């Protein structure tokens with residue numbers, strides 16, 4: 180999973196009277212809180228509490244993970260973006276993922292013009308031969324497509340090698356007819372993938388292919404049809420012709436994993452203007468979920 | 478002896494003349510592009526400061542409240 | 551002994567190397583190739599020269615020892631004709647003078663790729679300068695791709711590679727041909743879907759395949775790589791024959807679709823401009839060409855008739 | 864009609880989803896008003912086989928990308 184969700188589920192199962200809530204992306208929320216919103220202390224990516232914060236309520240916008248690591252190092256220095264997260268290219272002037280750990284093969288003398296997003300990195304790391312040989316579908320901007328569709332070999336229930344099969348026969352992916360006549364025992368499978376490309380929980384939908392040039396299989400009409408069908412079924416499942424946005428994932432997490440902050444959103448899916456903490460203060464929030472520097476209280 | 482004069486503007490500071498006064502000096506009088514305001518380890522200061530939406534501290538804004546310009550211009 | 555020649559590039563192990571017979575060498579006195587002379591028994595000398603090679607593996611790849619004694623350390627002098635095919639039969643060693651016991655460095659692969667190759671969005675490449683055409687039909691596609699990436703990393707002059715089919719009409723065979731110059735690269739996918747200006751034999755569209763270029767990496771291609779330039783234009787284009795337009799007489803309208811893009815790099819800006827102007831002059835359909843200098847390459851865009859007159863009294 | 868035609872045993876528990884239905888909680892704590900979802904689905908279907916819809920695309924494509932990154936934003940600024 181991630182360094183947090185393990186701790187979170189351990190706390191929830193063991194019932195130990197504090198659950199370290201962490202946002203989607205499975206990284207510790209900068210400002211954790213106690214079992215009843217008593218004392219929200221802020222932490223770092225490691226998972227420890229920063230000594231200089233135990234105040235009851237909510238800390239006044241505790242320092243971000245990038246800058247926490249930076250000031251820890253002070254006693255290379257990261258360049259934290261104005262938002263508090265790492266700049267996409269640290270500076271040897273390599274560039275980094277959205278976690279702090281440098282992207283593998285990106286050590287250069289000068290700043291790269293544009294170095295990969297997360298989905299491009301995952302695809303390339305797949306070609307190196309680590310992970311199931313099915314390329315995650317990447318949005319044009321480079322981030323993960325919300326709906327990821329990976330085929331499955333029906334016999335043995337083993338994932339269907341897609342890099343190799345599409346490399347060898349992408350004539351075979353012209354239409355579903357050809358695919359059936361080439362791989363009759365393969366049944367598609369589409370799920371909703373979060374910002375990190377991690378298959379969300381209990382949202383996979385094992386489609387069928389029996390009854391229905393491009394490249395990458397993310398531009399083939401096969402994938403477009405196979406995700407249009409998934410969104411159509413998702414409309415019935417959840418009324419929204421789309422997968423749950425980052426907000427709604429955070430919501431469901433908080434509701435399930437009881438901890439005092441539960442974000443709020445409305446059917447459009449974006450973060451509601453003002454998020455409120457039961458037994459605590461309210462505050463405006465931007466589209467990306469980060470609390471506005473100060474709004475505690477056209 | 479002579480002293481050069483510039484619709485354009487002299488990039489170099491004025492001075493009278495011997496010396497080789499620079500020919501390719503006078504050029505476009507650009508427009509203001511930065512405003513900044515001053516208020517009374519530095520990395521710790523800036524880290525704890527910007528975390529609140531933000532000793533000598535300056536908030537220069539590339540486009541009290543004195544105008545300047547981007548470094549190298 | 552007495553190493554450090556005046557003119558030499560600057561700035562167990564006997565079995566580690568793969569000796570190659572001398573017949574594979576094309577002698578050429580009028581050739582340019584950096585090296586490191588020396589003036590060294592015989593077998594002890596051979597081991598010494600090979601140890602000296604392994605000492606500085608940055609560019610020593612064609613260590614050769616003679617007995618007429620000397621031993622030099624050439625870089626990979628395997629210039630290949632710019633023909634897409636699954637065989638180094640077109641690749642021929644060119645050396646200043648036939649040595650006696652020329653060896654070469656066994657290509658050592660790795661598990662970690664040094665850099666992140668980003669595939670070019672260009673199907674066609676003209677003026678490429680192939681370095682080492684390799685067959686890859688033996689390996690699997692992903693394993694072959696990994697071998698190809700590693701091959702280009704191990705080559706300090708490789709400025710990008712190509713993992714692609716060759717002779718697809720006959721059936722096609724996968725090859726990892728590494729480039730030290732991408733040349734004029736054209737025939738993109740997103741650009742000029744309508745209004746194309748420019749290959750069944752090869753096929754670079756399927757996912758693994760493409761024309762990967764290693765990151766721009768402004769190291770300046772360390773100064774022992776073979777100097778490479780686009781083939782000189784046989785025709786001379788007179789810039790006076792083309793109206794240069796001021797940037798104020800043009801609109802920046804996006805969503806304009808009757809155009810097509812090309813990149814260059816490789817030669818001084820004037821050379822790239824002449825190349826793109828000639829490329830547009832070949833087609834009577836191109837009408838305006840605009841060049842902008844991107845960091846690594848220069849981007850020339852060809853638009854057809856696109857003018858928006860505004861009328862008034 | 865899909866429940867047997869296309870949708871198949873995967874990981875969503877159609878069993879549980881139906882056991883509160885005819886044969887509420889939803890995928891991610893999503894209250895589901897089944898009737899409204901079905902009505903919206905038929906709305907979208909009749910909407911997609913609509914002669915004017917094509918024209919909308921022919922116009923939605925035209926509008927500059929700067930004011931509307933994607934056709935959804937084109938639509939929102941048309942609303």
Ligand SMILES: *[C@@H]1O[C@H](CO)[C@@H](O[C@@H]2O[C@H](CO)[C@@H](O[C@H]3O[C@H](CO)[C@@H](O)[C@H](O)[C@@H]3O)[C@H](O)[C@H]2NC(C)=O)[C@H](O)[C@H]1NC(C)=O
Pocket residue numbers: 346347348349687715718721722723724753755756
């Ligand atoms: C680039 O050429 C590639 C050469 O490796 C080619 O891969 C080969 O493709 C053929 C089919 O096109 C495979 O043959 C298979 O399909 C036929 C269809 O009738 C069957 O009869 C055969 O038994 C077999 O299953 C080859 O096997 C495959 N290469 C290898 C080594 O197996 C790619 O198709 C080419 N890429 C493009 C874009 O054309």
Ligand SMILES: *[C@@H]1O[C@H](CO)[C@@H](O[C@@H]2O[C@H](CO)[C@@H](O)[C@H](O)[C@H]2NC(C)=O)[C@H](O)[C@H]1NC(C)=O
Pocket residue numbers: 390864868
């Ligand atoms: C429900 O689904 C079935 C199966 O998809 C439909 O039967 C198909 O109908 C189409 C025409 O709409 C035919 O082209 C297919 O050959 C049929 N398939 C089979 C297996 O019979 C059926 O029409 C749908 N409607 C109802 C009321 O069942």
Ligand SMILES: *[C@@H]1O[C@H](CO)[C@@H](O)[C@H](O)[C@H]1NC(C)=O
Pocket residue numbers: 332333334335361362363364
């Ligand atoms: C799926 O599994 C079977 C195992 O019987 C295997 O033989 C087959 O190759 C797999 N599918 C394809 C298309 O190869």
Ligand SMILES: *[C@@H]1O[C@H](CO)[C@@H](O)[C@H](O)[C@H]1NC(C)=O
Pocket residue numbers: 818820821
């Ligand atoms: C660029 O190089 C070519 C080489 O012959 C030369 O003809 C041309 O005049 C050069 N232009 C400039 C600006 O150096």
Ligand SMILES: *[C@@H]1O[C@H](CO)[C@@H](O)[C@H](O)[C@H]1NC(C)=O
Pocket residue numbers: 876877878879
């Ligand atoms: C959900 O599906 C499983 C098999 O995947 C099935 O055994 C189970 O009964 C279903 N849940 C319920 C509540 O029926």
